Design a protein around this ligand. Structure first.
Ligand code: HEM
Length: 212
């Protein structure tokens, strides 16, 4: 059984739960506020910053290397543009860094520093979702907040080096399936992907509480 299928199957239940967190439910319905959106985007900025520092650390490591697609997928530069848009030119000092974001970042560094064979779980959880449902969420954010089609403020959701998100997803999946894989590693990759999802759910629970 292929890793990319194992992961999708192992995370389908927790995905249903992540979509039905209060924050994403509100989001889905078009009820995102500028404050809420700013909080989540500032949190992703720290998260992707951590994920991508660790992808760099391990880019030559064969437990990750076949998924090294910085030009196409990396999000940090995009989030930096979005932060300047939403928080202004001194965004670096304005943006929050919540404890639930700190927790996710911490685990990202643990995985990247000490269990890099699990980094694929974290890249899967974030990038493949960004290439799928992320595009749906973009449209909702755009309509809710009157964001222009020109893309300012939504650089995170825009992949200028991928023509077709779905084709790239297929490539990414086919490359996932070339990773060297023992039952040990596979079993723990799918577990870690479930933790990645939980860390996101916990971020969302946290943000909702901060907002209400
Ligand atoms: C309201 C919130 C969300 C909506 C509406 C949503 C929507 C979707 C949709 C429509 C797909 C494609 C389904 C398919 O190809 O069969 C999907 C895939 C995915 N989503 Fe989500 N999603 C949401 C939240 C999340 C969150 C919080 C994460 C992770 C943190 C996530 C991660 C993924 C991943 C990794 C995939 C690809 C699954 C695979 O093909 O292996 N999404 N999302």
């Amino acid at each position: 059984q292929d890793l990319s299928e194992a992961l999708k199957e192992a995370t389908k239940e927790v995905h249903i739960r992540a979509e039905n967190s209060e924050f994403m439910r509100n989001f889905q319905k078009g009820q995102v506020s500028r404050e809420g959106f700013k909080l989540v985007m500032a949190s992703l900025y720290h998260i992707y910053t951590a994920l991508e520092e660790e992808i760099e650390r391990n880019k030559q490591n064969p437990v990750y290397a076949p998924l090294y697609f910085p030009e196409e997928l990396h999000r940090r530069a995009a989030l930096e543009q979005d932060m300047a848009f939403w928080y202004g030119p001194h965004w670096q000092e304005a943006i929050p860094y919540t404890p639930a974001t700190q927790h996710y970042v911490k685990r990202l560094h643990e995985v990247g520093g000490t269990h890099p064979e699990l980094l694929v779980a974290h890249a899967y959880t974030r990038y493949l979702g960004d290439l799928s449902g992320g595009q749906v969420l973009k449209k909702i954010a755009q309509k809710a907040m009157a964001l222009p089609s020109s893309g300012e403020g939504l650089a995170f959701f825009t992949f200028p080096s991928i023509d077709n998100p779905t084709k790239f997803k297929q490539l990414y999946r086919a490359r996932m399936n070339t990773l060297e894989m023992t039952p040990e590693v596979k079993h723990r990759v799918t577990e870690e992907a479930k933790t990645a999802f939980l860390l996101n759910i916990e971020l969302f629970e946290e943000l909702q509480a901060l907002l209400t």
